[PDB]
Each structure stands twice: as structure tokens, then as C-alpha cells.
Design a protein around this ligand. Structure first.
Ligand code: NDG
Ligand code: NDG
Ligand code: CL
Ligand code: CL
Ligand code: K
Ligand code: K
Ligand code: ZN
Ligand code: ZN
Ligand code: ZN
Ligand code: ZN
Lengths: 304, 304
């Protein structure tokens, strides 16, 4: 039988998953992300493939989802989330030290592919998978196929700069201009992420709270948190309206930590129309149907 | 046999074209854009279909390209460029008068489809057709098919707001914030168009010159025009790099009046790398291969 393996490699932990011909998840393991050695990164992955090869008596197709980009020419990763990985040719290493073809894909692309494979979305002309978590990431699907881009950068909406209307909301020349991991400044990755949410609160209120704690205070109706959340929802709507005016997606699926903030699903539909073109219609906006598993599933499904 | 008609309806004139089984253009007419009634708009179009039906002894497939958007639900056109058309159910009114299926498409979408049908681009995974003219328009092609969007708004990059790095180039709180036809403000349609090029020159130098005259003065090395052009090319690179970080197109084809400013093909490749991600690669950037005929050809090729 056909087995499909998937890996979701994150900053803090690696997640492994195995799916059978019916796509039933028959294995799930989480090891910590080995950092400060790349010998140790590599090992963790080939470890899990091997264990699983034995345990099911086969060697199945392999897919990897990682944050950042495999250079379309050299094969080397830009991934400032994973110190241990950066600069290496991850694909090639695994491809021989495993005796079979390895597919590699950006994490947001895996997420979008996982969500779009749902029966409900499979025939939509376009799907945008948006991760609002550690960073801001996008996966573009057109007629069921990932658009990965000339250099594997398609959907890197997190490294676009705040638009004018967002800057105006945040005070124009007084707006906080956050530095970015890509080395540019004012990229939305640092505003609409969970970390961006926290940095914004701290900028206006001079207190170093976590997103969950701000949100808890919001649910208690506390004044600063209510003001922060109003500002954040308007900022989110402005930024997304700019993106939707370019992409006009049929369905937008949200993932990552902030996708669990339920107010988003109420506030986005109310706030987007003001920033969209007058003749625009709202996309269908939905919370991820597979929770946190999109990375693993999409990585495995690269070899469907 | 098989004839294909195409119409390119602009602000100033309507252009008609007819193509045979081999795609040889056997007819070309240009009538003025009737704007004092919609009775007169409609007429101009049905006129030319009829003439051509007779003269070739057949009535073939019909495609129309127009600036703006036919409502994906009702059929009604938003085009503030064409007063006479706005609000009406253009498709239906023509689908009966001629007794056959009539396809309608945005002008930038037709342009991109016309360029993408070139043998050179036919198997490119993506093509962005970009019009820099009266306004700024984009046509998105993925694996050879137009992405028209949830509400026919895909590629409306002209109605995205200037990014932070563009505002910084133009002086931040001192940057000119131009009003837009869509009723938002700071849309790039009013900066990167031929009219935007003119308004920026006038903002900094208080003289009302046309784009051609500014460009002529640039070619003479004159101080103000050289300063303006340097600023404009940097603004163009910044805005496009933001868009390319989202879309990552394999090929970018430029059309419209400003696409004849040859300096763009030299300066864009030099200036884009600074504003793209470090791992990004330049798209193939090319001047339209069919000159000013993309509207007509793409409109005709809707039925291909
Ligand atoms: C180059 C880079 O680090 N960009 C990443 C992006 O690839 C990822 O999809 C997103 C969400 O995880 O976070 C970041 O914005
Ligand atoms: C809403 C609107 O009028 N947008 C148009 C766009 O449709 C067109 O493609 C572009 C280029 O011609 O100019 C404008 O930006
Ligand atoms: Cl001066
Ligand atoms: Cl220059
Ligand atoms: K992506
Ligand atoms: K368009
Ligand atoms: Zn960035
Ligand atoms: Zn507290
Ligand atoms: Zn606008
Ligand atoms: Zn002069």
C-alpha cells in the first residue's frame, strides 16, 4: 500500500505524521527543534522516517513543510525561524540519505493545500490560506493548484510594507515602524502576527503583555485592551482589503494562533467593505477546518 | 468557418478587430467613444458587428474588453472612464441584439491573455500583464488561465494604497496624497499612471507639463525632469516589488502609454532587487509584444 509522510518543522518543535491510502492519520510524533547544530536537525528528521518505515513495514512518499523558502536555484533555505537549518540544501541531504525523492514546501503553502483539499473547497477557482501566528504567511491556490512563484516567494504577504491607510490609522509620522527579520522595515509580518499584536499593545500602553493576556483583558472589557483590539481589527481589515483588491480570492481560510481569536470572524466582514472597492464582494472567510494540522497534512499531500 | 471578433472600448475611442481561424487580423476599425448617451454607445458596437458580419459572410464569436468591472451578479458595469456605459447590463443588451453568446472581460485581463498566448509565454506557470497608462491595471494569468477573482476584481493593483517605503521616498507626512476615482485616497493608480507621473511632476515643480514633454526634457538632461524621473523609477520599483513579494510572477509584461518609456526596462531590473526579499529572483520583464493591440486580441481570444 501507499503511505504518505509529512513533516511540519517549526521554530520550537518538529511534528511528524503518516497517512495511508485512505488518508487516515496512523502516526503523530513531536520532537523538539534541534538548534545550534545542523547535524542534529538532520538527524531528528531521518530518525522519525526510519522508526516509521519499520513500524508499518514500508518506505512512503516524503513531504516537508518549513517556514521560509528553498532557493529555487541552489536548494538552500532562508529561514530565520530555524537557526540550525539556514543556508543548507535540506532537500538534497534527505534525498540521498533516504534513498527516495523528497518534496519541500513553505509552511503557508502546505496549510493552504491542506485546507483546499477539503471537499468543500476543492472546486473553488481560488483559495487563499492565511497564517496569522509567529509571522504572517499566505498560500495561493488557483483552480486547485498551489502557485509557488518564480522564486518560491508567492504569498509572502508578510513581507509587504504597511499601506498608507494602515499608517494613517497608526498616526502617520508617529506610527511605530517595526524592523523585520527580512531586514526591511514596516513589513506587516511585524504588525498582524501574534508578536505584532503584542508589540502594538506595548507601543501604545508601555506594558509587556502576551497576546493571550491582552485578549483575556479584552474579554473582561478593560479599557486599554478594548482600544487595542478595535485598532487591531481595523488594521487587519485595512491590510487584508489591500491584499484582496489585488488577489480577489474566492475563499480565505485563516490559521495560526490568532486564527483562534473568534472576534476576527465577526469583525472582518463588518470592517472590510469600507476599504474594498464599492463593487467588491466579500470572500468566504473561514477558520481552518483541520486545526493546527495543516502543515503536516499539506506536507504529506505534496505527494498525492 | 471560424471568425473571432474583439472590441477594446476605451475612454476616447472604441477599437474593433476580426481574426480568422489562423488568427490573422482581417479587420481593424476605430470609432470614437460615444459618451453623450448610452443609446449611442450601444449603437457604435452593434454597427461594427453587423458591417463585419456582412463583409466576411459570417457572424463569429464576440469578445469585449472594457476598463472596470462587470458585476459578477447583476451584469452592470463600473467604469468611471466611460460615462455612457456605467450602470448598464452591457452583456445582456448585446447577447440579444446579435443572437449569440457574448463574453466580456476587463481590459487588463484581455491584455494579459493576449500577451500570454505568445508561443514564448505559453507554458510559463504565471504571467502578470501590467498596464501603465490612463490608470494602472493588472491581469493575472496562472498556468495559461485568467484569474478573474471572486467579484471580477483580481489584478486591481491600481486601487491598492502606496506602501510605507513609497511614502517614505515621497516625504512621509509631506508626501502628496492624491484622491482616487474609487473614492479612496493614495491609491497607486494616481501615481504610477501617465496622469500620476504628471501630477507628481507638478507637485514638486509647480508646472503643468504632459508626460511626453517631461520625458523630452529628461532626454535633454534638464534638472527638474532628471530629478522627477529618478524619483518616479524608484517609486515604480518600490510599488512593484511590494506587489511581486505577494504574487511572485514568472513573467511581467508592460503595456499602456508609459510602457513606451524605454528607460523603464533598464531601471526596473536595477532597482527592484533592493526592495525584493534577499532570496527573490527577478521576473522576466518585457515590453508588450503586440504593441497596443492586446485589448482587441485578448477580447477576441476569450472565445478561443
Ligand atoms: C521569509 C520568511 O521568513 N517568511 C515567513 C513565511 O515564509 C511564513 O509562511 C510566515 C508564516 O509562518 O512567516 C514568515 O512571514
Ligand atoms: C476600478 C477601475 O476603474 N480600475 C481600472 C482598472 O479596471 C483598469 O484595468 C486599469 C488600467 O486600464 O485602470 C483602472 O485602474
Ligand atoms: Cl526647483
Ligand atoms: Cl533614472
Ligand atoms: K507562501
Ligand atoms: K484586472
Ligand atoms: Zn520583511
Ligand atoms: Zn493581566
Ligand atoms: Zn482607488
Ligand atoms: Zn518644454
Amino acid at each position: 500500500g501507499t503511505m504518505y509522510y509529512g513533516f511540519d518543522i517549526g521554530g520550537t518543535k518538529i511534528e511528524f505524521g503518516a497517512f495511508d491510502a485512505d488518508l487516515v492519520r496512523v502516526a503523530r510524533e513531536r520532537v523538539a527543534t534541534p538548534t545550534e547544530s545542523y547535524a542534529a536537525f538532520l538527524d531528528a528528521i531521518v530518525t522519525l522516517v526510519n522508526n516509521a518505515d519499520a513500524e508499518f513495514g514500508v518506505k512512503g512518499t516524503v513531504g516537508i513543510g518549513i517556514p521560509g523558502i528553498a532557493d529555487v536555484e541552489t536548494g538552500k533555505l532562508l529561514t530565520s525561524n530555524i537557526p540550525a537549518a539556514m543556508g543548507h540544501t535540506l532537500q538534497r541531504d534527505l534525498e540521498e540519505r533516504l534513498q527516495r525523492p523528497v518534496k519541500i514546501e513553505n509552511d503557508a503553502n502546505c496549510f493552504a493545500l491542506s485546507e483546499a483539499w477539503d471537499e468543500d473547497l476543492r472546486g473553488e477557482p481560488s483559495v487563499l490560506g492565511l497564517i496569522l501566528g509567529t509571522g504572517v504567511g499566505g498560500g495561493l491556490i488557483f483552480n486547485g493548484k498551489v502557485h509557488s512563484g518564480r522564486a518560491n516567494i508567492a504569498g509572502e504577504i508578510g513581507h509587504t510594507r504597511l499601506p498608507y491607510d494602515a499608517l494613517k490609522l497608526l498616526g502617520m509620522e508617529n506610527a511605530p515602524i517595526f524592523p523585520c527579520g527580512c531586514k526591511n522595515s514596516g513589513c506587516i509580518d511585524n504588525y498582524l502576527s501574534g508578536r505584532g499584536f503584542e508589540q502594538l499593545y506595548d507601543h501604545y500602553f508601555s506594558e509587556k503583555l502576551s497576546a493571550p493576556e491582552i485578549i483575556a483583558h479584552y474579554e473582561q472589557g478593560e479599557r486599554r485592551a478594548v482600544q487595542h483590539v478595535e485598532r487591531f481589527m481595523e488594521l487587519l481589515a485595512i491590510c487584508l482589503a489591500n491584499i484582496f483588491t489585488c488577489l480577489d480570492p474566492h475563499v480565505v481560510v485563516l490559521g495560526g494562533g490568532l486564527s483562534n481569536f473568534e472576534l476576527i470572524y465577526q469583525e472582518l466582514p463588518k470592517r472590510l467593505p469600507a476599504h474594498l472597492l464599492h463593487v467588491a464582494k466579500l470572500p468566504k472567510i473561514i477558520k481552518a477546518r483541520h486545526g493546527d494540522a495543516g502543515g503536516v497534512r499539506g506536507a504529506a499531500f505534496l505527494n498525492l
